[model samples]
Target: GSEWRRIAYVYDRQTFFPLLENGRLLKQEGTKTAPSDAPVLVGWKDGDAIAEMTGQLAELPAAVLGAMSEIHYKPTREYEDRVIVYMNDGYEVSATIRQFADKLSHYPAIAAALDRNVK
Candidate 1:
């Protein structure tokens, strides 16, 4: 059976990769790196701000981690331009590429990078 765990994403413009982790893994692998040749669906330049989302609310911009308060997660789906997360209690959260860009707008550096990459 699957247990509740923290999840993270490392991406630039064209690709989004998800990482599953527990407390220990987070401490160890929280810091990450991406390849330069990675196909640039979007390009994040130097000094661009990247956000980290965690299951813990203490982390700002935590909503990007999905609705963690839900007791159970049914499944998740990611399309070319959007992602949908379903919860056991019938609550759902949908994030489109544009919406995600909007969410990151609070951080000017990241938002500017997103603007450059998201077409």
Candidate 2:
């Protein structure tokens, strides 16, 4: 009925990273505090390269700085190339991929989540 209840989920059977919202990043996750007594985090990324992304990376707002966030990275695959849906869930402050690196700096959990999952 409304976009609010839907999953920020926008991905296909390919490398196309699903664009998600700071809030949805949590919703698309598991139960709170995964035994580690901490909320999980996730990372999502568009097709931005390392060099360009580094230059434009901005700091994300406090709202999503320490939540169960997600930032998808490029894996070894000549996969999904078409850009698709973005930001399924929103937060008090929006988190464009541009600010992801900045967010990564503050939100250590984002990196933690990556280490645990991306490996």
Candidate 3:
């Protein structure tokens, strides 16, 4: 059996912030057209300080600016972390970890899947 090797995407704390603004930032379904339903975008920061996420903060559309606010303000020196996993091929898997301010630690379930080797 030709097994696909596991690939780990090690994202430094700063790198993960940009991903929030890329194609991944989708407008909320109803808000796409409705005036009242302004574009509700979703994004995440590697750490807690909103100021640290320069590029990501700038990319946010004005419509959903309020929703994509800095809600989780962590301590100045805390280490935030997060991880996600996906099956690259039928059997091969890849895992991504974002570390810096402690954001990844909040996503325990996602990280646990990697630790458990769940498909």
Number of the top candidate by TM-score?
1
Q: Each prediction's TM-score against the native?
A: 0.25, 0.21, 0.20
lDDT of 3 by residue, 38-80 (tens): 1111233432332333223234333222222122322222224
Residue 2 accuracy (lDDT) in model 3 = 60
RMSD per prediction, one decimal? Answer: 14.3, 15.4, 15.9
Cα distance off (Å), candidate 2, residue 67? 1.3
Worst 10 residues of 2 by lDDT: 79-88
lDDT, candidates in the order shown:
0.31, 0.30, 0.25
| Per-residue accuracy of model 2 over 1-119 as CA lDDT, tens digit each | 44332122322232222223323322333332322111112333432432233232322343332343333343343323211112224322222334554544464343334334423
Which ten contiguous residues of candidate 3 have the minimum total lDDT?
Answer: 32-41
- Candidate 2's displacement at residue 106, Å, is 18
Candidate 1 TM-score over all chains jointly: 0.25
Give the 10-residue window scoring lowest on summed lDDT in candidate 1.
38-47
In candidate 2, residue 44 scores what lDDT? 35
